[PDB]
Design a protein around this nucleic acid. Structure first.
Ligand SMILES: [Mg+2]
Lengths: 640, 158, 333, 422, 27, 49
RNA sequence: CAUUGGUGAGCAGCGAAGGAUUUGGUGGAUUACUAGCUAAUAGCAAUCUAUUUCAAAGAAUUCAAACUUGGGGGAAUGCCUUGUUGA
């Protein structure tokens, strides 16, 4: 499973996996710790710039995250790790196979709750020690005492008491003596969230049937009850800017605000996060400011701000609605296609099954941007035909990009699922272009290609026709008709002279683009699934249906190499920039490197998730691959 | 009145001066160690200084009545009756969605002079000066053509 | 940034000069901007002349005199690389010093260089006017403080008040006390009437960039981002020595009267508001005024300076101050 | 941000400091009774003398004004300057001023209020500081000359931006622009808070309710096309109606009736909201004129219901309340008058309510059905219930008579109900 | 003119927060 | 604690009446009036001129 | 007859709960992502400042210091240099 040429680098395009993020304050500034699968990222609350990432990938997925000043505690399986600046400093290993669920740190005590309703307490070896390491004691809540633990919390001004919140009721545990100080009355509804209020002795509890309870621990009595019918609470948080506001997040993807003083609703933010991915998994008011940070399972993190009231007097009643401030995001579902935008490791295009196309920056996450889909007005002046309700374009099946003419006109072509035309995009403006290319044979688009000069675009139809357009004006120039089955690949050499095509019928046609003549035709035994053309060496490889990669020299029109060994279909493959290697992935969950001079496999990997795409950087320093699972992109460094 | 009492607090004795933050708790300069009950009470007073006590916690508690109208507004977020149950369509807003053309499967060569839905079956009939009777199976997604009938020299006015 | 700030004598107007060349003159109480220049040059300091109508700016190599609206009036070719500017109001004399180590007095009214004196001690590090006698105090790299008058080619007095360069100098209103900070992390309070050193705060946490003395006698110190104030420091008694902390609450020890920390900013210059209980602070990101009770004189004398002057009083005040202008040679110890 | 923008903010904060003579001339020249040239010449003692006399006349009209003689119109108030006061003292000052503007809201037609208010304009500079309260109290006098004088000497807040053009303009603000000002949602929250204070203080008067109702009614009219914006109005203006119904003053209640009706016809609402709406209407219904208007509102609200349960019976608690505030004889008079509005859906729900909860009124059902013609479905529902009554309830002479009434009218439909039920 | 709805720049302000470290004590 | 600052009553120093003359406060502290001897000499020289 | 001159009155065609022109404000980018403050081998982040002071170290006959001037001619009184008188 360990490559001798490649090694993991990091994952691009993930901001949050849905686990509740943790907010930490250093001095005046704040930072947000978000979980990404087996590692966490730390963003600056001011600019949402990445600062640190976990040095090593955790063996198992992270379940809980808590941050106190420099130190960050990350829980996975039965181990709680302590991290500083993204480097592990110490590992806490619990003595029970039960997996940790929740994590609370107050004072010198670290409290870990396992799924078996057992709470483990650690203590600092020295009062001045930075983090707890020593094992103090174990507290277990039995079914008679209460139900499953919902979350651990510690209210302010409580000496060595831990407020254990269970589904049935709330409990108060004195960690120092390990004795149950107080037991709450049983509640009718199942509790799902707990948030300490800025007031004393009051903890906000959220039920599964839209009830928010301002339970008073000192009195052991209810103080208030907000009602949210037909909703499920997922997060609670209080505004500490001197205004008594409460933000109640819900699994449906809504965020409601209540003004406790006036017993009124300020506003509701609808569909900030997708309901399919858990809605508002976490929403936290920044301590003492009107900014609220919200997250969800849709791979996005947002910030909203309350502007000052617009009335000089009675600023309390006239509350401005929350305003979008900033955010970072990625794909909600795994990317379908990828490509390297520029010669350097500069930018990377990604299109996913969520119908969104993104331009990702390898060198700074802040630079990553979504390519907008707002259309140009037609040159003719006729009205554009489209549904009034705005919907994203279908999934991108194929993509081709060139940079010979970036900034002068369109330079990207994309093919869509079950769509009879290919759309154009402009990388410089980062928006859809103004040209649409039709196959003109009632056939779906199966292949797209661009000439190196950036003047022509080739569209391969499912009915066997190749249409050639001009990118500058989007006017059709030539149409080639040789294949009777779907064309699965098109390429043109650097000199814009010889053109090569491949189709499911198994024939590879060789064309002279200047003279528009058929130089020759080659029949292979099996249907051809994909094509990669190497312009520097004039060699192109074809992924045949019989689980082979056939390399052909366009100059002489003969098979030069044939590669065998894959046990299933070849999802994708690419040439190395120097033209010496081919890296291919297949459904059998492996990536193989093929040395073309010798025509043999020199390296092999076993990936847990099938590699749907593989792409070398033009430099050759980085290899990027995408998998059937995971919203991000896996980046590999080339040890060669 | 406190529902619970913790005896550990009365016995424990903490030093204040060890750390910078706690030093502000001292009532006099001479003292250096205070028992737990006083230590908590000092913390509570200092906590209020960080977060002032708002009005809602103290003065207000929930624990024909005129305020029924106010209460019902709080619980309900969508204040319009769901039009699904109502059998009577709204006056000014029409909920209309377009589907695929009926003629897309097999186009007509003249104006559609007349249309008719079959009383029970899902068929649509079109006639025109093209002198043809084209019947379509209106399914809303495909609309394929069931049959046709050309009537020579018989313009279809209806 | 960074920004150097100088208030007018009557405290009605404010002049800020960015280092990159942003000069603005405004009436800060009523929020009215009089002039704003965006000279694409390196401005070091600026000062108001007889009144708010004219101000002078020390640019890269020459000092420029400007009008109320920002129109240039003169380019002072004779002043080269002036870094410090001061105005003797009664004498109508403009004073400059800089890397040339030349102290030049310029008469605004007549436009004649009254006298140019060679300091012979290299670049001048600090400058402050003694309002009582209008004798200029210059600090140098060798740690000496020299007192100058237009009519003497050589300093009236030389005082050794530091073992490194003197970064700043400040003089009380009465002209009786002088405060000097040096690069040796030392602050010394001097008695300039008799030339007797009173206090020596030998060790400071960091070198003090600036010092300023208010009308009431408050002593201000700035150390990078810190701003600290002491009250009654300028006294001959030993107990009045500035101290940062009292040992066991010793009543004799003089702890700071007030403190404030500009978290990420290195303080550029300190100026007390003339007749208000405020302390102006210039720093990298702009200007800020700190409220300092007891800082300013409560009882101004309208005959000399009036914050509430109208324009008609101003133009009358301008002429009569010009009529009884004191001659330059009158300046003596 | 540029240096100019920050200084502009500094200029606004020190608007009333009176730093120099020119600033004093602008601030002191502002007046409601005197032109600029004469205003500048005046002294605070002169202005206070007239105001002191003016407040005395107001006190005769209404004793409550006499209290302000102790606080705002005292001889010591002459030396009181707002700028030198601390934050706590200013808030205390603003509470007194805000209270006065409420009393003066109804007496602006009297000349003394113009002289009583001049003291606050000159001394406390309310036209610069408390501009929002001053405009709101005088909002309904927009066509009067006094409002024109207020607009001239006043700097408009951001929310009152629509009135900017009518500053120092010969024409008074038009009724149409007044709708535009109310159209803004932030203004409605601002006005609602002000109107809430009036309800708390019983400071309302007829002219305020008339003007407030019209703008509220007109706002719904302007947003009738926009259903989404109507949805945003429901939390605010219905919440106002709840407060208005709480006022013991009958005029306030009638305004709530006027406001409530327009929403129901403008926007269909849940039967839960309509049911709750009645309970508030009937809870505090004491004045006869309110009772007349209320009953008109009750029937209109049901008429808008167009969903299953459109004519279902009232809940038990609601029915008892309605009967107490409206006896059967009263409604028989209501159905008697020829000009009765369409109320059949309510009568059907009321009719079915009688059968479920009261057996003694069954004779009243017969009388009601004759007076008002019910629609076909409503008749069918009534027959369906009365069939159930016969099987459960003992057969009575009145009960059979109600059937006999249906035998006379549309005998065939009576069989249809019987066929479906038994 | 309708009500101007401008989005003013919002910059952070230092805010004091309670430290839970004082909560723990040892016998 | 006990905090008090200089506070100027604008009405005292800027008269409300436009016709009234502006008040002229006086402090005879010598510290506010430097160069007593030099100023009187020049006024003597100007009078002689 | 031609306008590749302006202003209009209408078609063909395009055409999913509308289409077009202009514009205010904020947010993210425009260099390659190792976190805030301070008296910084650590504290703070609720700051301490009731240990923050002492000790030690630290002073070139460089005791030199306009590399900084628009050209021509001078400079009474100044200022620089050199000598000189008398204390
Ligand atoms: Mg714009």
């Amino acid at each position: 499973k360990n490559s001798k040429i490649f090694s993991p680098f990091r994952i691009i395009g993930n901001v949050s996996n849905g686990v509740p993020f943790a907010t930490g304050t250093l001095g005046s500034t704040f930072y947000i710790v978000t979980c990404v699968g087996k590692t966490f990222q730390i963003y600056d609350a001011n600019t949402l710039h990445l600062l640190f990432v976990s040095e090593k990938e955790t063996p198992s997925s992270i379940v809980a995250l808590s941050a106190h000043f420099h130190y960050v505690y990350a829980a996975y399986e039965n181990k709680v790790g302590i991290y500083k600046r993204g480097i592990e400093e110490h590992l806490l290993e619990l003595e029970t196979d039960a997996n940790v669920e929740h994590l609370c740190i107050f004072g010198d005590y670290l409290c870990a709750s396992t799924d078996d309703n057992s709470i483990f307490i650690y203590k600092k070896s020295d009062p001045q020690d930075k983090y707890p390491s020593e094992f103090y004691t174990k507290l277990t809540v039995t079914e008679i005492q209460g139900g499953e633990i919902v979350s651990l919390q510690h209210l302010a001004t409580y000496l060595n008491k831990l407020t254990v919140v269970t589904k049935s009721n709330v409990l108060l545990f004195n960690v120092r003596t390990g004795k149950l100080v107080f037991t709450s009355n049983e509640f009718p509804d199942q509790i799902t969230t707990a948030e300490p209020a800025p007031v004393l002795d009051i903890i906000a509890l959220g039920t599964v049937t839209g009830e928010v309870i301002m339970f008073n621990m000192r009195k052991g009595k209810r103080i208030r009850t907000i009602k949210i019918p037909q909703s499920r609470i997922s997060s609670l948080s209080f505004r500490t800017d001197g205004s008594s506001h409460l933000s109640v997040g819900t699994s449906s993807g809504d965020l409601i605000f209540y003004d406790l003083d006036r017993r009124s609703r300020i506003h509701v933010l609808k569909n900030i996060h997708r309901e399919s991915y858990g809605g508002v998994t976490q929403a936290t008011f920044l301590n003492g400011q009107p900014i609220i940070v919200t997250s969800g399972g849709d791979n996005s993190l947002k910030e909203y701000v309350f502007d000052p009231s617009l009335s000089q007097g009675s600023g309390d009643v006239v509350v401005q609605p929350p305003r979008y401030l900033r955010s970072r995001g990625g794909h909600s579902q795994p990317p379908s296609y990828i490509a390297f935008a520029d010669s350097q490791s500069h930018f990377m295009l990604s299109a996913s099954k969520d119908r969104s196309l993104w331009s990702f920056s390898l060198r700074k996450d802040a630079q990553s941007q979504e390519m907008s889909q707002r259309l140009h007005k037609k040159q003719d002046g006729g009205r554009v035909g489209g549904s009034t309700i705005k919907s994203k374009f279908p999934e991108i099946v194929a993509l081709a990009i060139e940079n010979a003419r970036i900034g002068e006109w369109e330079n990207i072509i994309t093919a869509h699922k079950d769509e009879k035309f290919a759309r154009t995009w402009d990388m410089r403006n980062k928006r859809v272009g103004r040209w649409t290319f039709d196959t003109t044979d009632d056939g779906f688009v199966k292949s797209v290609a661009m000439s190196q000069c950036g003047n022509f675009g080739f569209i391969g139809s499912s009915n066997g026709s190749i249409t050639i357009y001009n990118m500058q004006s989007g006017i059709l120039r030539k149409k080639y008709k040789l294949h009777k089955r779907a064309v699965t690949g098109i390429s043109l050499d650097g000199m814009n002279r010889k053109m090569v095509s491949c189709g499911l019928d198994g024939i590879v046609g060789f064309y002279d683009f200047n003279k528009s003549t058929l130089l020759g035709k080659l029949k292979l035994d099996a249907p051809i699934t994909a094509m990669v053309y190497h312009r520097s060496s004039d060699l192109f490889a074809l992924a045949l249906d019989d689980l082979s990669i056939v390399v052909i020299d366009a100059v002489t029109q003969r098979v030069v190499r044939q590669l065998w060994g894959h046990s299933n279909r070849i999802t994708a493959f690419d040439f190395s920039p120097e033209g010496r290697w081919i890296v291919s992935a297949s459904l059998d969950s492996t990536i193989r490197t093929w040395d073309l001079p010798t025509g043999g496999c020199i390296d092999g990997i076993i990936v847990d998730n099938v590699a749907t795409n593989v792409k070398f950087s033009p430099n050759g320093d980085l290899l990027a691959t995408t998998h059937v699972t995971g919203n991000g992109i896996c980046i590999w460094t080339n040890r060669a | 009145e406190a529902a619970w009492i913790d005896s550990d607090d009365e016995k424990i004795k903490v030093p204040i001066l060890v750390t910078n933050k706690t030093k502000k708790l001292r009532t006099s300069y001479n003292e250096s160690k205070i028992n737990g009950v006083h230590y908590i009470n000092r913390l509570r007073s200092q906590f209020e200084k960080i977060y002032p006590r708002p009005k809602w916690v103290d003065d207000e508690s929930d624990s024909g009545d005129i305020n029924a109208l106010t209460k019902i507004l709080s619980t309900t977020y969508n204040y319009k009756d769901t039009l699904s149950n109502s059998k009577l369509l709204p006056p000014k807003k029409l909920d209309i969605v377009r589907l695929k053309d009926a003629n897309a499967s097999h186009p007509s060569h003249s104006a559609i002079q007349s249309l008719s839905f079959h009383p029970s079956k899902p068929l649509l009939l079109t006639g025109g000066y093209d002198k043809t009777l084209r019947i379509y199976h209106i399914d809303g997604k495909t609309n394929h053509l069931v049959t046709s009938l050309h009537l020579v020299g018989s313009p279809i006015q209806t | 940034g960074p920004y150097h700030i100088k208030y007018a004598k009557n405290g009605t107007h404010l002049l800020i000069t960015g280092r990159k060349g942003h000069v603005a003159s405004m009436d800060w109480r009523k929020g009215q901007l009089r002039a704003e220049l965006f000279l694409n040059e390196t401005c070091h300091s600026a000062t108001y002349l007889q009144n708010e109508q004219y101000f002078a700016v020390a640019q890269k190599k020459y000092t420029f005199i400007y009008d109320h609206e920002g129109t240039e009036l003169h380019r002072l070719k004779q002043h080269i690389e002036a870094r410090h500017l001061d105005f003797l109001p009664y004498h109508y004399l403009l004073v400059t010093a800089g890397e040339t180590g030349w102290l030049k007095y310029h008469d605004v009214s007549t436009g004649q260089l009254v006298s140019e004196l060679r300091t012979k001690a290299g670049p001048t590090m600090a400058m402050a006017q003694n309002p009582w006698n209008a004798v200029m105090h210059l600090g140098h790299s060798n740690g000496t403080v020299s007192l100058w008058s237009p009519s003497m080619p050589e300093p009236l007095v030389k005082l050794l008040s530091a073992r490194g360069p003197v970064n700043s100098i400040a003089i009380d209103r009465s002209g009786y006390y002088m405060a000097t900070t040096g690069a040796d992390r030392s602050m010394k309070i001097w008695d300039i009437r008799n030339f007797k050193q009173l206090h020596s705060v030998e060790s400071l946490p960091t070198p003090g960039t600036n010092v300023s003395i208010s009308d009431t006698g408050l002593l201000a110190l700035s150390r990078g981002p810190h701003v600290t104030l002491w009250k009654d420091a300028l006294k001959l008694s030993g107990d009045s020595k500035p101290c940062f902390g009292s040992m066991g609450g010793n009543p004799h020890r003089n702890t700071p009267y007030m403190s404030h920390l500009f978290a990420g900013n290195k303080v550029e210059n300190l100026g007390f508001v003339p007749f208000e209980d405020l302390l102006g602070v210039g720093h990298q990101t702009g200007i800020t005024n700190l409220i300092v009770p007891g800082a300013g004189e409560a009882n101004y004398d309208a005959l000399e300076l009036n914050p509430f002057e109208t324009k008609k009083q101003r133009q009358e005040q301008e002429v009569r101050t010009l009529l009884n202008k004191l001659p330059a040679d009158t300046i003596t110890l | 941000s540029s240096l100019s923008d920050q200084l502009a903010q500094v200029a606004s904060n020190n608007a009333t400091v009176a730093l120099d003579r020119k600033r004093r001339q602008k601030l002191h020249s502002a007046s409601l009774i005197y032109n600029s040239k004469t205003a500048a010449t005046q002294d605070y003692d002169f202005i206070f003398e007239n105001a002191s006399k003016a407040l005395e006349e107001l006190s005769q009209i209404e004793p409550k004004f006499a209290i302000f003689s102790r606080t705002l119109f005292s001889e010591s108030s002459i030396s009181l300057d707002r700028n030198v006061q601390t934050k706590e003292e200013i808030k205390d000052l603003d509470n007194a001023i805000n209270a006065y503007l409420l009393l003066a809201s109804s007496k602006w037609y009297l000349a003394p209020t113009l002289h009583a208010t001049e003291w606050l304009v000159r001394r406390f500079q309310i036209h610069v500081k408390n501009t929002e309260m001053l405009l709101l109290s005088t909002l309904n006098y927009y066509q009067t000359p006094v409002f024109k004088r207020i607009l001239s000497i006043i700097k408009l807040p951001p929310l009152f931006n629509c009135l900017s053009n009518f500053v120092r303009s010969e024409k008074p603000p038009t009724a149409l622009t007044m709708i535009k000002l109310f159209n803004d949602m932030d203004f409605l929250k601002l006005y609602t808070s002000y109107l809430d204070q009036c309800i708390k203080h019983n400071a309302t008067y007829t002219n305020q309710l008339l003007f407030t109702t019209c703008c509220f009614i007109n706002v719904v009219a302007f947003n009738s096309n926009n259903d989404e914006k109507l949805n945003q109005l429901v939390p605010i203006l219905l919440e106002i109606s709840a407060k208005l119904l709480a006022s013991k003053s009958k005029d306030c209640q009638i305004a709530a009736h006027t406001i409530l009706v327009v929403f129901a016809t403008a926007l269909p609402l849940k039967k839960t909201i309509i049911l709750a709406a009645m309970e508030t209407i009937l809870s505090n219904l004491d004045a006869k004129e309110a009772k007349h208007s209320a009953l008109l509102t009750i029937c209109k609200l049901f008429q808008t219901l167009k969903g299953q349960g459109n004519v279902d019976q009232l809940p038990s608690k609601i029915f008892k309340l309605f009967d107490s505030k409206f006896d059967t004889v009263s409604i028989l008079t209501f159905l008697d008058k020829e000009d009765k509005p369409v109320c059949d859906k309510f009568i059907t729900s009321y009719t079915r309510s009688i059968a479920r909860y009261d057996r003694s009124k069954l004779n009243i059902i017969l009388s009601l059905l004759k007076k008002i013609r019910l629609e076909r479905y409503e008749v069918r529902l009534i027959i369906t219930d009365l069939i159930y009554l016969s099987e459960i309830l003992e057969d009575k002479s009145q009960l059979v008579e109600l059937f006999e009434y249906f035998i006379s009218i549309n005998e065939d439909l009576v069989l249809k109900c019987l066929k479906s039920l038994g | 003119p309708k009500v101007v709805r401008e989005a003013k720049k919002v910059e952070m302000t230092e805010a004091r927060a309670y430290n839970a470290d004082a909560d723990t004590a040892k016998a | 604690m006990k905090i008090k600052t200089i506070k100027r009553s604008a009405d005292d120093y800027v008269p409300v009446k436009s016709t009234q003359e502006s008040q002229m406060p006086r402090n005879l502290n010598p510290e506010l009036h430097p160069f007593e001897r030099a100023r009187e000499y020049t006024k003597a020289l100007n009078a002689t001129k």
